[PDB]
């Protein structure tokens, strides 16, 4: 794969707390690397692009998403692997490809706020993945027509295109087409 | 074997979390990335290819038919049978069907080219008559084959409530008949008696009607061939009962009015010595519609005759044979859900019979599963269990952090 | 008709009957007839093909069994008593007529075993007219009660697909009108 200390810690997470990540990045600094260590993607053809931050949110650990962003790691790394691929190619879970699109597609609001409203580098909602699909294109992808799914899909759907208007006061995000030519409404249809 | 679902379920989906006793588990969690996880079932006893006694051969053969469909409609069992059907169960079944249909073509051609002169037509003396002999030898094989396979079944799997048992209970009985008649017809065709034909002619019609056996490869036709057998029980035998009372009643009543032929040679006006017999057929034709009243003045009281025919036609075509249609509708709406459940047993019994017919090295080649290092057995010994994956999705049970064997989620092929 | 072959007709005759049966296409303008032309197509699938399957097994079985009893015409010119070279063929039709009802048994003494012949016809008539063709009626009732709700939903797609096809065929200034 290319796995490193910092992924391995977060996979092997003790009740939402692995005390090693504050340490390894201290030693990472005193030799010197943060924008090469945290960012280090799995160079597989199956976890391609995945980083420690893509792992920090799927484990549902908020405390380190602050930490990984506190050093300015990345919030637009694209998990393009065959795993990070829809269930129409030979994959399992397509959330889009971005950490923002992940947190929205996992019913985790507080990070979706944080990655937008934080001190450090912000994740904008206009960023397209490798198929044009923004966060709202992705919520239409992970959605099913069950009861609990359509609950947080609509909430996190609403939460963002409202938030897109208080942020960039221009074309709504729902207008952003993709690399097939479709919008989130035409993508749901 | 006893039909205890509630505990049978609970065993197969036994998730134990505390790692001192995780080895007492049969549902594992191989990986879980976000809201998608792979559950991994223990097929230690279920799918044992040959060597050990199995849960799956017990549900399907010697169990309680009242709950098999609920015991086969749980965790991996159903997925496990579909995983056998696509490998070998489908194919080998569709070789069994073409081989049978051909054998009945081969049994068709002989009877059509079987001569009809003299003693049983032994003399062949041509090529075509040797081609026919190939059809009679291939035939007699089918008879003795279905004979031996059903008698070894009498020492082994056989004898549930036969012919009220829609899981090959009836067809076992009918292939056995077909096995006899091909042996009887070959005996009389070789003993010199010339009624080899009549017995052979019943065998032919069973065998094409025994090709309904092979309607299990599709829910459509398999659900069809069991309603036929249910609408032949809770339906058209009840009809045959009363219909034989109305018919003997009138057939005796109406021929009682016809005058004898001693009075003189002409039957179709008169009564003598086969009147009843032919007259039942004319009444069988009337109820169904392909007859003609053919009203008769030869009777002594002609008006009372037609009072009785019109009651036959009302109480048999307008009342019973149309009620016969209506009871089916009350049947096929009720036995539909049963019929989808009986097919799942038929279909499953088909697979395990094909599987059971293979050698153990070939069953052990078409295994439905995989060795996985599911945990340590408290001695360092890794537990290598033959298991079965089931991808599953849940957007509500977010804390899936219990038993993640493979920390790297995906199967990473 | 232009190459000189004279079977333009036979092919033309199949075209004619499709086209009038393709006028069921235009039953979409009413929920009545559009719901009707799709049940016809469902009762032709989860219904009368299953019937054609077994009915061809009962029929080949008996048609081969009953003609096996008739004596050849080498024995001599008269078919309707005897067996020769189109016996099977015509005899299937006489069995197709029996199941549906527009036939006559036309019971035959020319066979070598006459009594066993009528034992088999009566089983054909019971297991095909009294059992299957009436069960065929009963399965439809189980169908048309189940595919009714589906059928009202499929019409709404048929009906909608009809509109957008007409609309799509217009120029943009006329759509925009
Ligand atoms: C591997 C997964 C494949 C998935 C893709 C789909 C594949 C489909 C292949 C289907 C094969 C089965 C059909 C063949 C005919 C057949 O099986 O006919 C059967 C019986 O035939 C035999 O007895 C013949 C013995 C040989 C059979 C296997 C030949 C095929 C072998 C090749 C397949 C590949 C694997 C192994 C080859 C060896 C090397 C090791 C591999 C690993 C890598 C090296 C008919 O049933 P019958 O007894 O009449 O019914 C039962 C009667 N009753 C009990 C109901 C009354
Ligand atoms: C449990 C299975 C075992 C069955 C037991 C019966 C076995 C054998 C009996 C045969 C011996 C009797 C004949 C010998 C004497 C003889 O020769 O008698 C002949 C006439 O005799 C016959 O015609 C005998 C008719 C046989 C049929 C019996 C029923 C067969 C089985 C019925 C059950 C299966 C149904 C299937 C139908 C489908 C529908 C339902 C499906 C189920 C529901 C879907 C005399 O004439 P002749 O020309 O002179 O003969 C030559 C004599 N000569 C001149 C050479 C001396
Ligand atoms: C995929 C579509 C394409 C179809 C492929 C077939 C096309 C073409 C075949 C035609 C060429 C063969 C004839 C040439 C030889 C000839 O000439 O042969 C003739 C006799 O030949 C025929 O009769 C040919 C019958 C054709 C019908 C085929 C089926 C047509 C399509 C069937 C499907 C549609 C069903 C609809 C029915 C409704 C129910 C269901 C609706 C659906 C459910 C609701 C010989 O006699 P002669 O007088 O001597 O001829 C003159 C010769 N001479 C003396 C001049 C040299
Ligand atoms: C004695 C020599 C005989 C030579 C071989 C003759 C043909 C054998 C068929 C076996 C080859 C595979 C095709 C059948 C399997 C199949 O398609 O099974 C069924 C559907 O089947 C049919 O509707 C076959 C209708 C009647 C067929 C002819 C019989 C003779 C009638 C005349 C579903 O697919 P299944 O594979 O089971 O599903 C898993 C496949 N999945 C998704 C993993 C790729
Ligand atoms: C990719 C796969 C590779 C393998 C390829 C196939 C390999 C080998 C094929 C071997 C053929 C023979 C197998 C026999 C299996 C068998 O014993 O079958 C029996 C069926 O009775 C027989 O067979 C009778 C015995 C005499 C043989 C048949 C006639 C003579 C040979 C004819 C072969 C020619 C074929 C076809 C020519 C026409 C073709 C049109 C294609 C069209 C494709 C659409 C299974 O009954 P049972 O399960 O026991 O269920 C019965 C009911 N009960 C007892 C369980 C309640
Ligand atoms: C549990 C299922 C029901 C049990 C089986 C029922 C059997 C019914 C058939 C009874 C025979 C009817 C005709 C009379 C005999 C006849 O007509 O001829 C007999 C032929 O005897 C049979 O074939 C009797 C077979 C009995 C067991 C069934 C087959 C095997 C299966 C066993 C059942 C399980 C021959 O002597 P014959 O011709 O009078 O003179 C010539 C003497 N020579 C030339 C042969 C030396
Ligand atoms: C538990 C009950 C058991 C009782 C069984 C008793 C049956 C029969 C024994 C008596 C018959 C003996 C033979 C008759 C004499 C003879 O040889 O007569 C022959 C003709 O042929 C017959 O007469 C035999 C056909 C039937 C006749 C009517 C009886 C009908 C019996 C019906 C039985 C019904 C069962 C059941 C009901 C249906 C529902 C299912 C049950 C309940 C649930 C399971 C000679 O005529 P010919 O010389 O031409 O006479 C001419 C006279 N002329 C012109 C001079 C005046
Ligand atoms: C509940 C069902 C059973 C009811 C039965 C009770 C009713 C009637 C039975 C008694 C009839 C007696 C007839 C007379 C006796 C006889 O037959 O006299 C014959 C001739 O007769 C006649 O000329 C009678 C004229 C026609 C009227 C018939 C009756 C009325 C008809 C309407 C009936 C309606 C109800 C019912 C039918 C519909 C049923 C479906 C419901 C549902 C069922 C469950 C004797 O010849 P001759 O005088 O020598 O010949 C003429 C003189 N010449 C010219 C030769 C010298
Ligand atoms: C996907 C749907 C199925 C594909 C189309 C199936 C076609 C079936 C018809 C095949 C022809 C049957 C009769 C034999 C030919 C015949 O009898 O006459 C042929 C006529 O040939 C045809 O019309 C073949 C048309 C084929 C494509 C379909 C139509 C176009 C649509 C294409 C399909 C999509 C003429 O030469 P000939 O008369 O022997 O000698 C006289 C020579 N001269 C005077 C003409 C120079
Ligand atoms: C997968 C199975 C594939 C097997 C296909 C094999 C079919 C046919 C090949 C063999 C026929 C070759 C021609 C015969 C010779 C000939 O030319 O005979 C002609 C007569 O015409 C025939 O005999 C041909 C009509 C049919 C005959 C019976 C066979 C029935 C075949 C039925 C096939 C059933 C399929 C399927 C079942 C239904 C359910 C759906 C399936 C399952 C799901 C999809 C010459 O008579 P003549 O000289 O006058 O003889 C007189 C003799 N006398 C008087 C001297 C004694
Ligand atoms: C489960 C369905 C299949 C059952 C089949 C098994 C039953 C019977 C088959 C065997 C019959 C054998 C008949 C004798 C052999 C034969 O044919 O002998 C012939 C003549 O015969 C007779 O005189 C036999 C008298 C009539 C009684 C027939 C049988 C009893 C009839 C009632 C059957 C009831 C059950 C069933 C029918 C209703 C079915 C609907 C249910 C539902 C279906 C699913 C040989 O001529 P010859 O002696 O030379 O000519 C006369 C002598 N002279 C004057 C020329 C010198
Ligand atoms: Na009629
Ligand atoms: Na009629
Ligand atoms: Na009805």
DSSP 8-class letter at B65:
T
Instruction: Looking at the complex, report in whole angstroms how far the Cα of residue B397 sits from the nearest Cα belonging to chain A.
Output: 11
> How many Cα atoms occupy the beta-carbon half-sphere of A108 within 13 Å?
24
DSSP 8-class letter at A116:
T
- In this structure, the strands spanning B382-392 and B37-42 are antiparallel
Q: Which residue of B has its CA nearest to A149?
A: B395
The DSSP annotation for B210-234 comes to: GGGGGGGGSHHHHHHHHHHHHTTTT
Angle formed by the axes of helices C147-168 and C132-144, nearest 10°: 60
Given the CA of residue B149, which atom of ligand 1 is nearest to it? Answer: 56
Angstrom CA distances, B43 to B3, B13, B359, C82, stand at: 19, 11, 20, 64
Angstrom CA distances, B21 to B29, B85, B388, stand at: 15, 35, 21
Q: Which two tokens stand for residue A110?
A: 């507080």
Single out the residue of B316, B314, B327 nearest to residue B280, CA to CA: B316
Counting runs of H as helices and runs of E as strands, what totals does chain A give?
9, 0
Q: Whose CA is nearest to atom 42 of ligand 11?
A: C123
Q: Which residue of C has its CA nearest to B107?
A: C64
Q: Which two tokens stand for residue C35?
A: 């719901």
Whole-number Å distance between alpha carbons of C141 and B334: 12
Query: Residue A17 forms beta bridges with which residues?
Result: A14
Question: Distance from the CA of A168 to the center of ligand 10, in angstroms?
Answer: 78
Given the CA of residue B244, which atom of ligand 7 is nearest to it? Answer: 38
C104 is in an annotated binding site: yes
Q: Which residue of A has its CA nearest to B33?
A: A58
Task: Tell me if B68 sits within 8 A of B74, measured CB to CB.
Answer: no
Residues in chain A: 189
The DSSP annotation for chain C comes to: --SS-STHHHHHHHHHHHHHHGGGGGGGGSHHHHHHHHHHHHTTTTTTTHHHHHHHHHHHHHHHHHHTTSPBS-----TTTSB-SSHHHHHHHHHHHHHHT-------SSSSSHHHHHHHHHHHHIIIIITHHHHHHHHHHHHHTTHHHHHHHHHHHHHHHHHHHHHHTS-HHHHT-
Residue A90 CB neighbour total at 10 angstroms: 11
Gyration radius from chain B CA atoms: 31
Q: Is B180 in the pocket of ligand 6 (CB under 6 A)?
A: yes
Q: Which two tokens stand for residue B384?
A: 């290598």
Q: Which two tokens stand for residue B325?
A: 């249609």
Task: For chain B, say whether C67 makes contact (Cβ under 8 Å).
Answer: yes
**C touches B, CB cut-off 8 Å, minimum 3 pairs:** yes
Whole-number Å distance between alpha carbons of A81 and A83: 5
Q: Which two tokens stand for residue B196?
A: 């080899």
Gyration radius from chain C CA atoms: 24
Resolution in A: 3.0
Task: Tell me if B402 sits within 8 A of B29, measured CB to CB.
Answer: yes
Q: Which residue has the tokens 């015509």?
A: C90
* B33, B407, B408 member nearest A92 (Cβ): B33
Helix, strand, coil proportions of chain B in percent (round to 5)? 55, 10, 35
Task: Tell me if B317 sits within 8 A of B323, measured CB to CB.
Answer: no
């Amino acid at each position: 794969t290319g796995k490193t200390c910092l992924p391995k810690a977060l996979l092997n997470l003790s009740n939402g707390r692995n005390d090693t990540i504050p340490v390894l990045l201290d030693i990472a600094e005193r030799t010197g690397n943060m924008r090469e260590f945290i960012n280090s993607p799995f160079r597989d053809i199956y976890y391609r692009g995945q980083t420690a931050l893509h792992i920090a949110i799927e484990r549902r650990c908020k405390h380190y998403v602050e930490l990984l962003v506190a050093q300015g790691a990345d919030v637009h790394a694209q998990a393009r692997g065959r795993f990070f691929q829809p269930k129409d190619e030979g994959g399992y879970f397509y959330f889009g490809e971005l950490p923002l699109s992940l947190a929205a597609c996992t019913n985790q609001p507080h990070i979706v706020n944080y990655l937008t409203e934080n001190p450090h580098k912000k994740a904008d909602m206009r960023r397209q993945d490798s198929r044009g699909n923004t966060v709202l294109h992705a919520l239409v992808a992970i959605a099913d027509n069950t009861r609990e799914n359509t609950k947080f899909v609509t909430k996190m759907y609403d939460l963002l295109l409202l938030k897109c208007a208080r942020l960039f006061p221009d074309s709504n995000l729902e207008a952003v087409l993709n690399n097939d030519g479709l919008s989130p409404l035409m993508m749901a249809a | 074997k006893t039909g205890k679902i509630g505990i049978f379920q609970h065993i197969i989906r036994r998730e134990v979390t505390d790692e001192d006793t995780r080895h007492l588990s049969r549902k594992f969690k191989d990986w879980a990335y976000g809201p998608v996880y792979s559950s991994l079932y223990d097929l230690s006893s279920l799918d044992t290819c040959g060597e050990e006694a199995s849960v799956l051969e017990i549900l399907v053969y010697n169990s309680k038919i009242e709950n098999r469909h609920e015991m086969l409609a749980v965790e991996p069992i159903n997925e496990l049978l579909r995983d056998k059907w696509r490998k070998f169960g489908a194919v080998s079944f569709y070789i069994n069907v073409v081989s049978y249909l051909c054998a009945m073509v081969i049994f068709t051609l002989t009877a059509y080219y079987q001569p009809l002169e003299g003693t049983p037509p032994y003399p062949y003396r041509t090529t075509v008559d040797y081609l026919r002999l190939a059809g009679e030898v291939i035939t007699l094989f089918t008879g003795v084959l279905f004979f031996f396979t059903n008698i070894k079944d009498l020492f082994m799997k056989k004898c549930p409530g036969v012919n009220s048992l829609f899981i090959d209970g009836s067809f076992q009985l009918l292939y056995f008949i077909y096995s006899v008649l091909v042996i009887v017809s070959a005996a009389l065709y070789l003993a010199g008696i010339e009624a080899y034909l009549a017995v052979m002619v019943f065998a032919l019609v069973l065998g094409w009607m025994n090709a309904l056996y092979f309607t299990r490869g599709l829910k459509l036709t398999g659900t069809y061939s069991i309603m036929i057998q249910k609408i032949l029980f809770k339906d058209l035998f009840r009809f045959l009962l009363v219909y034989l009372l109305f018919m003997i009643g009138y057939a005796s009543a109406l021929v009682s009015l016809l005058n004898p032929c001693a009075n003189v040679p002409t039957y179709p006006s008169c009564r003598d010595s086969e009147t009843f017999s032919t007259f039942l057929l004319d009444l069988f034709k009337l109820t169904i519609g392909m007859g003609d009243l053919e009203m008769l003045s030869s009777t002594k009281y002609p008006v009372v005759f037609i009072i009785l025919l019109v009651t036959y036609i009302i109480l048999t075509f307008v009342l019973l044979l149309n009620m016969l249609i209506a009871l089916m509708g009350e049947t096929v709406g009720q036995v539909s859900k049963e019929s989808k459940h009986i097919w799942k047993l038929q279909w499953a019994t088909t697979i395990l019979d094909i599987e059971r017919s293979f050698p153990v090295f070939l069953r052990k080649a078409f295994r439905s599963g995989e060795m996985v290092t599911v945990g340590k057995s408290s001695d360092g010994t890794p537990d290598r269990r033959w298991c079965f994956r089931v991808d599953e999705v849940n957007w509500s049970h977010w804390n899936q952090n219990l038993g993640i064997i493979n920390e790297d989620p995906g199967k990473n092929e």
